[PDB]
Design a protein around this ligand. Sequence first.
Ligand SMILES: Cc1cc(-c2c(C)nn(C)c2C#N)ccc1-c1nnc(N(C)Cc2ccc3nccn3c2)o1
Ligand SMILES: [Cl-]
Ligand SMILES: [Cl-]
Ligand SMILES: [Cl-]
Ligand SMILES: [Cl-]
Length: 273
Amino acid sequence: GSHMEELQNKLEDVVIDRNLLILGRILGEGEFGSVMEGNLKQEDGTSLKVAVKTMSSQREIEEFLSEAACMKDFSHPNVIRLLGVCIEMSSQGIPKPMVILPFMKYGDLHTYLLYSRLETGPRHIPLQTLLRFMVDIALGMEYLSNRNFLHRDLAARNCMLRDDMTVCVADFGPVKWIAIESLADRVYTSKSDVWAFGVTMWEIATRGMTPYPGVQNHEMYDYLLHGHRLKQPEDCLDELYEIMYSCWRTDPLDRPTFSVLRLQLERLLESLP
Ligand SMILES: Cc1cc(-c2c(C)nn(C)c2C#N)ccc1-c1nnc(N(C)Cc2ccc3nccn3c2)o1
Ligand SMILES: [Cl-]
Ligand SMILES: [Cl-]
Ligand SMILES: [Cl-]
Ligand SMILES: [Cl-]
């Protein structure tokens, strides 16, 4: 029908021919796989600089392609533009799937925050700019939430900085970002994403501190159970702490929506001289 036809459209759009892609050096290589730089040859002739994320059976490949087809369809300046996917096969007969992304020379936001505290890195980031990062993330999440898409892994390390210093949310799905009900019931809503956004906001206000200093990951559920939350960063506005705090209300339904948060953030940013 319209649902199957709509899905089949998206599947055609999302796959890239392997010969239009040249893989380069490894930029990072964890347990999940590898991020590598690459060139993508475009419709208009010219090559584009890309990042290539390499991620085990035929069932999982379809699921991957279907999911990738949904993400390719996103279109917002504060949401990373998925350019397409390639599937290579290994010699051992294991299919290696590859996610093609625009190359982001300024990297992730977490590293950028930490670097800003080092002489050779980017100049001290003023609050006006820090707040603007939060607005950008809110905007991207607002978009995603409107389309009922759940990120499942919102954190400063998964927000990327474009060449114009615009922040986009990326790396779609770390105990300290997980909302209380998701630790408990293993259930995840947009209000769970809002919780993570609160934590992400706190990362930016602290210029990259790890959440909950003094609290081990295994201590996290009981810590939150007894009503403790992230503490107000020094020299952080009370109104800004009020906003981020509202993201961690015990009852998911008491937490604001991304659209409400985004608007609260913009007003606060306007008020700054
Ligand atoms: C968006 C995205 C989607 C998927 C994914 C998943 C989990 N399931 N399906 C089906 C897909 C698809 N398609 C996987 C990874 C990403 C992603 N987003 N950001 C990145 N990075 C590796 C960060 C990055 C980006 C750009 C960049 N340039 C230099 C360095 N850089 C670093 O990875
Ligand atoms: Cl992008
Ligand atoms: Cl860019
Ligand atoms: Cl730190
Ligand atoms: Cl804390």
